[PDB]
Amino acid sequence: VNSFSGYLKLTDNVYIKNADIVEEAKKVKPTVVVNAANVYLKHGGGVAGALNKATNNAMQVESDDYIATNGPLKVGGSCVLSGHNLAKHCLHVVGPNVNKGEDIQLLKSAYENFNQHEVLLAPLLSAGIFGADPIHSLRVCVDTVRTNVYLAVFDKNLYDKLVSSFLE
């Protein structure tokens, strides 16, 4: 039903909220939730681990089946799998891990996957353990994505920095 509420307009197609993306997915029933994935679709921590836990491991079993046919995803790549109880679809997207020397330029590729979907509930890509500056990631999202993105940011201090950078 894509019942988004309380999202702050950044641009005509990019919205942001200080929220837990799992709790958003349950309230919003989005067509697409984006997972911040790794190439093996192993949902061991961060957003991935949270989404998977909220599916009680349904997401991990399906992800394994996919990886059995595909092998690992490419950096900047994606796959569309079931959203289970969280969403119709989960778009698993792999941003570059800059800690492992993956090039930050691949972040554009990663966000370009969002343009295959009219409306998404998403995290910021390559944040947290993949080591990209989250405000940089937001700029790449705004520059790259032309479909309607609803970004959930868990941490209030980071949320305020993002909104301050964008609007002040």
Q: Which CB sits closer to ligand ANN, 88 or 161? A: 88
83, 122 in Cβ contact below 8 A? Answer: no
The least distance separating ligand ANN from the CB of residue 82, rounded to whole angstroms, comes to 9
- Please state the φ and ψ torsions of residue 148, each to the nearest 5 degrees: -90, 115
What would the two tokens of residue 122 be? 């998403």
- The C-alpha atoms of residue 22 and residue 27 are separated, in whole angstroms, by 9
Instruction: Examine residue 148 and tell whether it contacts ligand ANN (CB under 6 A).
Output: no
Question: Of 4, 13, 18, 31, which lies in the binding site for ligand ANN, with binding defined by CB under 6 A?
Answer: 31
Range in contact with ligand ANN (rule: CB under 6 A) among 23-31, 105-113, 128-136, 137-145: 23-31
Q: Which CB sits closer to ligand ANN, 19 or 127? A: 19
Q: Quote helix, strand, coil % in the chain, to nearest 5.
A: 40, 20, 40
Strands 148-153 and 119-122 come out as parallel
Instruction: Examine residue 87 and tell whether it contacts ligand ANN (CB under 6 A).
Output: yes
Which residues form the interface with ligand ANN (CB under 6 A)?
29-31, 83, 87-88
